[PDB]
Amino acid sequence: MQDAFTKAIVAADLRGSFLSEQELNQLTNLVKESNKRLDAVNAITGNAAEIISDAAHKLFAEQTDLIRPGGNAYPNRRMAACLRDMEIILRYVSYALLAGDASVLEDRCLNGLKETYVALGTPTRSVARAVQLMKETAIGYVNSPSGVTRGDCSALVNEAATYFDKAAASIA
Amino acid sequence: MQDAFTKAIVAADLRGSFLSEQELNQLTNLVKESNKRLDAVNAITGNAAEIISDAAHKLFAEQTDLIRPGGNAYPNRRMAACLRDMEIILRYVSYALLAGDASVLEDRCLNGLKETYVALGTPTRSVARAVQLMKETAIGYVNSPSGVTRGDCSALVNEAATYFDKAAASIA
Amino acid sequence: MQDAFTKAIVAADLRGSFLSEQELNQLTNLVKESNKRLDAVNAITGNAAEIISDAAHKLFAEQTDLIRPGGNAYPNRRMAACLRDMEIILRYVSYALLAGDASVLEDRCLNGLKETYVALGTPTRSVARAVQLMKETAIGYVNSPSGVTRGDCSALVNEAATYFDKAAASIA
Amino acid sequence: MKTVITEVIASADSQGRFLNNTELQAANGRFQRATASMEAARALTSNADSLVKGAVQEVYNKFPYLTQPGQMGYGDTNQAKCARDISHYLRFITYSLVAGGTGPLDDYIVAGLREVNRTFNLSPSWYIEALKHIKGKVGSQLSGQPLTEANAYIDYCINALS
Amino acid sequence: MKTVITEVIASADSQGRFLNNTELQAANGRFQRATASMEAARALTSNADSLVKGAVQEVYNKFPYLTQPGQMGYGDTNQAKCARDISHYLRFITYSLVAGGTGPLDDYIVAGLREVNRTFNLSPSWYIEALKHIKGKVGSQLSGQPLTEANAYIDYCINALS
Amino acid sequence: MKTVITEVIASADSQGRFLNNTELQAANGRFQRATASMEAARALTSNADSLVKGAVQEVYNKFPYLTQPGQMGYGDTNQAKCARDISHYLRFITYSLVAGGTGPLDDYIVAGLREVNRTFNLSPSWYIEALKHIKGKVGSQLSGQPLTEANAYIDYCINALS
Amino acid sequence: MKTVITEVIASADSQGRFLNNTELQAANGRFQRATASMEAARALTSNADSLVKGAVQEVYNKFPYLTQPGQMGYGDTNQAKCARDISHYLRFITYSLVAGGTGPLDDYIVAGLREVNRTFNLSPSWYIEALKHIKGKVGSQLSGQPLTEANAYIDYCINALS
Amino acid sequence: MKTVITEVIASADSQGRFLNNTELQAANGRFQRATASMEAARALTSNADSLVKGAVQEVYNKFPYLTQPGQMGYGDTNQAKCARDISHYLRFITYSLVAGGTGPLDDYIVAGLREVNRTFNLSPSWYIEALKHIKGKVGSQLSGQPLTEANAYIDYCINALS
Amino acid sequence: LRPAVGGTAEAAAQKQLGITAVAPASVVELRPNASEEDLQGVLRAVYRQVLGNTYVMESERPTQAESLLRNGSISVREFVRRIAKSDLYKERFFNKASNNRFIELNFKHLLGRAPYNHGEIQEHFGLYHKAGYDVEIDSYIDSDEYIETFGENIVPYFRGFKYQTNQSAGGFPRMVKLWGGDAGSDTDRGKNGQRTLVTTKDL
Numbered sequence A, B, C: 001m002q003d004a005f006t007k008a009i010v011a012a013d014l015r016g017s018f019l020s021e022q023e024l025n026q027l028t029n030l031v032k033e034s035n036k037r038l039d040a041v042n043a044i045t046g047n048a049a050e051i052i053s054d055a056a057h058k059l060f061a062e063q064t065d066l067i068r069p070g071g072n073a074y075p076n077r078r079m080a081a082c083l084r085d086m087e088i089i090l091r092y093v094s095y096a097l098l099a100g101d102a103s104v105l106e107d108r109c110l111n112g113l114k115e116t117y118v119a120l121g122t123p124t125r126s127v128a129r130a131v132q133l134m135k136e137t138a139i140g141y142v143n144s145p146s147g148v149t150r151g152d153c154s155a156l157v158n159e160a161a162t163y164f165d166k167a168a169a170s171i172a
Numbered sequence D, E, F, G, H: 001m002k003t004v005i006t007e008v009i010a011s012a013d014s015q016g017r018f019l020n021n022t023e024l025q026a027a028n029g030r031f032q033r034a035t036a037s038m039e040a041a042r043a044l045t046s047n048a049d050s051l052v053k054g055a056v057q058e059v060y061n062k063f064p065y066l067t068q069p070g071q072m073g074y075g076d077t078n079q080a081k082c083a084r085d086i087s088h089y090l091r092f093i094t095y096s097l098v099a100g101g102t103g104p105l106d107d108y109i110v111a112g113l114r115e116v117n118r119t120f121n122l123s124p125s126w127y128i129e130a131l132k133h134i135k136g137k138v139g140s141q142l143s144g145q146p147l148t149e150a151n152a153y154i155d156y157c158i159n160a161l162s
Numbered sequence I: 001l002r003p004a005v006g007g008t009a010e011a012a013a014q015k016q017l018g019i020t021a022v023a024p025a026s027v028v029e030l031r032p033n034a035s036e037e038d039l040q041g042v043l044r045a046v047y048r049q050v051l052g053n054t055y056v057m058e059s060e061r062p063t064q065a066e067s068l069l070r071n072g073s074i075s076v077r078e079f080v081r082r083i084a085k086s087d088l089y090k091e092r093f094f095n096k097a098s099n100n101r102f103i104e105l106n107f108k109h110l111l112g113r114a115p116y117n118h119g120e121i122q123e124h125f126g127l128y129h130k131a132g133y134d135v136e137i138d139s140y141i142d143s144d145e146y147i148e149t150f151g152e153n154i155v156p157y158f159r160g161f162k163y164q165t166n167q168s169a170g171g172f173p174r175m176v177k178l179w180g181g182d183a184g185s186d187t188d189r190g191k192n193g194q195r196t197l198v199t200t201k202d203l
Ligand SMILES: *[C@H](C)[C@H]1/C(=C/c2[nH]c(/C=C3N=C(/C=C4\NC(=O)C(CC)=C4C)C(C)=C\3CCC(=O)O)c(CCC(=O)O)c2C)NC(=O)[C@@H]1C
Pocket: A066, A071, A072, A073, A078, A079, A081, A082, A083, A085, A086, A088, A089, A108, A109, A110, A113, A116, A120, A122, A123, A126, A127, A130
């Protein structure tokens, strides 16, 4: 697995050099913002069940066809599998946000996913829409945690957004 | 696994409809002929060793090549494998006849068989000829009265014939 | 597994009561001394290879029989196994010192160790002597760490001593 | 889907054996039951519209709060989803009657039921109340062995929800 | 021993589930067949001495050399062992009829048969000829579904020997 | 019980390795958090009697039907068991604060929760309403990092019920 | 690479669980230690040329024979490879300080070390001699918690060589 | 196939070792035996036509019934297949002598033998009688260590048939 | 020069315990382009390990499964999973036995070791009751322990009787209670039937 720190080391190793002061500076800034990052990871885990539920309700209102007979979310077995998938993707995005690197998301969740979905006949664009709906809910929780000290979390929100976006682009 | 009843249900489910009276009638007819069907399945099982033996004797008389050195049924290890395959195909045809649907034959026995034979260098056309020889023997046994109440079994015989034919066409 | 905190909770649960202020105070004291504890665990880990080596040298000088032909530490296969065992026991003592509770040592290392040794024909008293030799080396490292803030570590040293003593008493 | 016929075939295949009299006797038992099961299935199908309407109303009578605003029973979409769900239950019961196994019910309804109901906050008790209403009305419509067949598949659902 | 009843219970236990209508339908099939199976079993038991003696003589007619000196059929002990073996076959066939499965035959006769026959140099063809003789005589004694049951268990043995 | 300390030790043991700086850094994080966690735990313990009373009343206000006769809220024994259950929740939250992991909550409450609630027909929604009531009152009592710790353990329960 | 952060994520993934306060506490410990670890890493980087030169000379003083002709210390290529190897060790120590785990050292140096050293006939004692020299010089440069961090990673190497 | 050389290589490969003196000593045993084995193989090859003719006639003498009509010995096709089969046995015996193992016999004849013989109703006793005839004639042709080698491979076949 | 008084030979302990053939158990791997001789070796090894040195008559041999293994359609790991889900396995080890006895039988057969704690019993008994037999058997075959040790081509072998990394100390005495000897078996066909060798009291 990789994290932001580990990624910098691997680059420096290929050059065969001691980490540069510029590289060090980036890492120092990551440590400086680490408290905010921890708060963001907390927000997703604390609201995880709500995020998935809220997304699911929106998806099935948007796409009635999936829940009708012949749809990929019919019957109960398939609906259950769909909810499981959403939870897995959210788990890996939260992991990536703690790590500060999308590698864990790519290597464990995203690799092979499009091929699997095509074989199953699952509609990838709908899966991607579900990931976007989860993103909007999740980002809201990150943006509005209760009793956290007021500050600018914009960079962390953007980073979260990219991980969601990567997942969506891979899936579709 | 699937059977004739289960197949009708699956179709109705995709329509999201209660089974139609016409669909019900077809299934009722299957129940009406079920005693005859059970007799036919019994005939294959009861004469299974004879069916394979009779086929094998005819095959090796017809095609001297297979039993000569350099032939695919030489030496004893290969000949044993050949006899095993004949028994497996007959088993699955009998399963299909009880089910009333060819799926079990197609999903387990038939899938990938031609590719396997081609890789091995087994001659597929000979395998197909073996399945046709088995068919003629098996049909005779179902046709024989055998201390069973005499009736018209022609539809069951035709259905059995198709299952044999599917197997032969897949392999060929 | 169990640690000092976990042990207190389990007790209070059986009473079905909230942890009492006195019980809380005990836990607070463990947190207050936690830096010293971390330094002690570091001392064992940092000197682990030396601890085992110094013990082994002393053991084989004390008991020449083990290394003579027919001895339990003769030949190389047995000698290797002996050194492996010493390292395992040291590992578990270090685990227990971080936990602040002997349970991990008792549950995973100590239970069935004596039985194993008796079945093998390994002399348990010599194993116990090895654990005592390791203790003297280890405690020296804990008592004289390099660059650490000068303080009284005596309570932690006594705790380490007890874990070694438990192991010796079980084995013998 | 698990049916008597698929189960015997699957067993034989696992042992790598031809079907023997043991299997064929089981198969015969399915075909004898079939006449009662088909009669049940026809009655449930014929009265399915009325059965669903009464079942939904019973839920609203048993739990008056649901109908009040801000509750799951309130509003057309919610009420429509209720009628749809009860209809699903009936449909899979009739399928199971005709199939000669609980397999249709197991694959379509029972698998994943708990996870789905949790996520969508659907109470098992609503479904149970509707199925029990149906069971009472079916009892009026059917008698003897048809009734026994019907009751078994309705009871299977009730126990799975329970 | 494999019977319809043991097999359904075993399946349920493997799934860890209470027996459902699928299993009970199978069970009903066993209990209905039982009347025909019992009729067969009684008839085979009543004629068992005559069936065995004819069966043994048929083997000696089909293979005349066995009776000649220096051959497996020759001598009282050898001939006695023949009658014992055929009697075992009949006994396990009637047991299978009553049990409602091939399990009695499978556990007592079929397992180890090939190894035993090889070691003792007992030809499967002798047994098969005896069983075929029995099948002919049974056909005279029984008719319809009794006859069908009898023939199936005799055929199972013949295929296992083959 | 999962705590930071048990988890680092378990990892080391699984790899069969001595504890290293990686583990010790993790361990240091638990011991630094401990002061805020203890402060939360003391405050929850001090107001636990009042927290439980308000939480129980909130459930009855949120679901008025329960209080009516023939319902789970009705009667002294039922109401007593409510107060007992909420008390248990609080107790295991304070234990988790002191332990430095969710392990106490996981082993005592979360494991088996769904099966128990199903059998006894106890709604997850009642508990969730009570926990949310507590969360609001805790917010008044605590601030900053103590508050953050408290909120995390309350949230864990809410998600487990959800 | 094993770091505090990767290890907590790996544990969570193995259980298939969301990250909880237990994991986040561990993570907090890594980020707090980072200030001391960075200070160590900067000091080792600044004095890396001097540290390596002295370390190589110390090995030649501790084992005078190496420098004599026909010995592995003798000759420019051999001496150059010495300086390269000590430099590698220092580089991976600074990487481990910044990464917040022993993982950089484990993946690049420790895995395969024994096999490589055997084949190329490189004594662990020469490396250990150099590392111990470095440890003494670092002790002059750093104090307190920075020093403790530095010492831990040099000690890890020494134990792995031992 | 199985030979001394393949077996030593297989053992070494399983342990993942280079071949040692232990293996090479075994190999030397095979190469020394080769002179006797070759002499046997040449003698069996020279008399193979006569050996087969006598062997087939012996079978007909030992079991006179086979020659009678409606029996396996009767007819040109049947008699030709007999001579073919015995010839195969000789060919695989000479191959085994040259190979320095029973592997040629094992792969061509012994594998699948029982199943083939069952299906085609070929008695092991006919083959055994032919092999024993050959063994007697070989004894006249060969002496000493050649004879020992020959006898071992003929005996291997006899035991496999038995 | 003088020998040790006690003076056992290396291997003495193994000799005394009767674990001399299994303490360092030989490892059999199915290799690519395997000969027929080589495949038969693997099958023997599988039946011995997975069925607990119980006899398998020729009627019971799977045959179709072996067809796949010979083809390369399945791996040794898949073959082992088919045998464990088969009625050959179920009849011996599952139908007569209790869960407690079944679980420890599975560890010995599939993992090659004894159960390390009562938590392993708790986990596998829980799985069975929620998901039945096949899910249970899958757990052992689809476990990091399985996958790291045996992987795909290696037949399971006895790991107990030697120190394994996460082993508890109780692990070696427990393997001694599970091992009857070379001639031992885990056979249903006894006077007492299938009883628990490793009690809860032990765990
Ligand atoms: C929900 C948003 C949509 C949906 C989902 C859906 N998925 C499946 C089946 C599978 N999904 C996966 C995906 C994963 N498994 C993993 O381990 C990971 C991470 C690596 C993912 C994301 C897999 C492997 C399967 C196949 C096997 C299984 O079911 O577990 C289904 C079922 C497919 C079917 O029809 O049988 C469904 C329905 N489909 C929708 O309608 C939503 C838009």
